[PDB]
Amino acid sequence: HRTLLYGHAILLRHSYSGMYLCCLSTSRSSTDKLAFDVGLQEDTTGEACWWTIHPASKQRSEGEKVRVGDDLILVSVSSERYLH
């Protein structure tokens, strides 16, 4: 039971399917070119399934622990994009 701290690499697992949220290399996005698609992946290995939490506003600070009800910005490690 470690605590979420802003900037940490978090792993999100789908409770039902059992796969993990990931940034798919496929580009289905409508004329976005540099954007990817967000899906589910089985294997945990690879930076794709890992996301980094960033503070939404100036109330929170980098390295501070995350609190319930806060807003987040999730950054993919492999692609360096945001959940948009």
């Binding site: 580009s27 070119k33 540099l34 930076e47 492999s78 692609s79 360096e80």
Partner: protein, 48 residues
């Protein structure tokens, strides 16, 4: 270096290969020597 592969992938996504090939294949305008053969050089401040 994952950063290096990421940079290359980003640049490849930005610029398709076919676009570069086509721009390289775009033709030029060469000077002509007509009407007594005086050199008619196209202006370069407007040209390709």
């Amino acid at each position: 270096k994952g950063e290096a592969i990421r940079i290359r992938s980003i640049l490849r996504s930005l610029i398709p290969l076919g676009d570069l090939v086509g721009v390289i294949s775009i033709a030029f305008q060469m000077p002509t020597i007509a009407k007594d053969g005086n050199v008619v050089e196209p202006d370069m401040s407007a040209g390709f």
